[PDB]
């Protein structure tokens, strides 16, 4: 397993940020790939025993670094919007015979570079409690969570029941809807369902939090707009079990 940080990153054209990547499997080869949507990964850098051995015409603004056997960095600066991509770290070549070969990928840093941060907007998040007609037709209850008005589409949405994250009964839209499909600067919207037994929803002790992690500006970004500065933040909506009427 290869770890990467951060998961998501929004950058203006004059920020500098560093991507971190870790593996502890003792792999002697480490890789940086760039992946654009609906495209296969494109190799950028390959390190071999901490010496750089492959650089695939990568522009200097992606400046890589390998401090030790198990850690690999990619430093970013003066980026351009076409640099928006998924940046994937990988590793391979176990120590010297003792172990068959394979290749492991981290989860990547999802990076969006924008020309003007004026358009960054955190989502509004709202939870909609189940239909009673659903409860009685099917003995199941579906909550919907709407995240709307956000930009760019760097959101992680999770459901929490009684303080613990849940995955069963959840479906989150693979892709965010464009709210103004014509415009280039369209804020996005994202749906999610959480479905539980009618018994479970009718228990008022049960607690349902829809949580959207929004990746926006850092403190380092200048903000002159009157409205609130759209920093990286979490936006949640809550709901509790409703008993029979």
């Amino acid at each position: 397993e290869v770890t990467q940080t951060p998961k998501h990153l929004v950058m203006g054209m004059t920020n500098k940020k560093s991507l971190k990547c870790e593996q502890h499997m003792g792999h002697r080869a480490m890789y940086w790939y760039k992946q654009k949507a609906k495209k296969p990964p494109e190799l950028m850098f390959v390190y071999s025993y901490e010496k750089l051995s492959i650089n695939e015409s990568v522009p200097s603004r992606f400046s890589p670094e390998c401090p030790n056997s198990s850690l690999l960095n990619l430093h970013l600066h003066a980026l351009q919007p076409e640099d928006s991509a998924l940046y994937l770290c990988a590793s391979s070549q176990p120590p010297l015979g003792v172990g068959t070969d394979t290749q492991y990928f981290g989860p990547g840093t999802r990076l969006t570079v924008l020309e003007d941060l004026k358009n960054v907007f955190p989502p509004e998040v709202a939870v909609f409690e189940p239909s009673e007609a659903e409860i009685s037709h099917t003995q199941k209850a579906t909550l919907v969570c709407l995240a709307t008005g956000f930009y760019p589409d760097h959101v992680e949405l999770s459901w929490w029941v009684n303080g613990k994250e849940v995955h069963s009964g959840v479906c989150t839209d693979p892709q965010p809807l464009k709210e103004q499909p014509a415009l280039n600067d369209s804020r996005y919207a994202l749906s999610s369902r959480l479905r539980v037994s009618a018994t479970f929803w009718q228990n008022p002790r049960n607690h349902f939090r829809c949580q959207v992690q929004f990746y926006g500006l850092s403190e380092n970004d200048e903000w002159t707009q009157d409205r609130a500065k759209p920093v990286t933040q979490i936006v949640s909506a809550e709901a509790w079990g409703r008993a029979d009427g």
């Binding site: 296969p40 709202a126 189940p130 659903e134 099917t138 069963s168 479906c171 539980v196």
Partner: protein, 202 residues
């Protein structure tokens, strides 16, 4: 200067079906053929590879074939499960991962078999913090396709499937929402073809 050709670019099957992906490659000296599976939001994961000299490898429902003389190689999924839904990349190399040449990718979707279809549309409870009204089209067969809205302020998401693991119950849904005044449930999905027997309560 070499290529790997992946076909098809899109593949959609029913849970239980098999699925096959055919690749070709131009570099004769290629001797390593990995296959990557990337699920939404994750990095690619290497699922099978054929390190040549041989024509077939099988690992449970996953199997690959290679023909060096034709420079074809293939991936076969039998008994597809919805958790096989992902983008698959084939690749050919002669010098390890360092010189992988990559297919352009195939998006595999495996829709689930819906045991007891129960097509209905429900009005969800309003939220004290939203102006929106939300309509849920749920429990429909998978042979049903949800078009988008022909209205500007009517937002319609595409089909989504959730798995209530503990009761072995999969379920399709789709969501429409709007703040405009002339918007109720009986007309949200009008631009779509719901089955004839979809339930509309009051």
């Amino acid at each position: 200067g070499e290529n790997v050709e992946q076909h098809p670019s899109t593949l959609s099957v029913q849970e239980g079906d098999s699925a096959v992906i055919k690749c070709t490659y131009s570099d004769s000296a290629s001797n390593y053929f990995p296959w990557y599976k990337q699920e939404l939001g994750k990095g690619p994961q290497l699922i099978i590879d054929i390190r040549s000299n041989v024509g077939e490898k099988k690992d449970q429902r996953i199997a690959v074939t290679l023909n060096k003389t034709a420079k074809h190689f293939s991936l076969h999924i039998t008994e597809t499960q919805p958790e096989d839904s992902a983008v698959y990349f084939c690749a050919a190399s002669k010098r390890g991962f360092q010189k992988l040449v990559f297919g352009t990718g195939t998006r595999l979707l495996v829709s689930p078999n819906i045991q007891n279809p129960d097509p209905a549309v429900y009005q969800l409870r309003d939220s004290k913090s939203s102006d929106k009204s939300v309509c849920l089209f749920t429990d429909f067969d998978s042979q049903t396709n949800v078009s988008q809205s022909k209205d500007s302020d009517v937002y319609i998401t595409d089909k989504c499937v959730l798995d209530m693991r503990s009761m072995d119950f999969k379920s399709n849904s789709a969501v429409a929402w709007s703040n405009k005044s002339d918007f109720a449930c009986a007309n949200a999905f009008n631009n779509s073809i719901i089955p004839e027997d979809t339930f509309f309560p009051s």
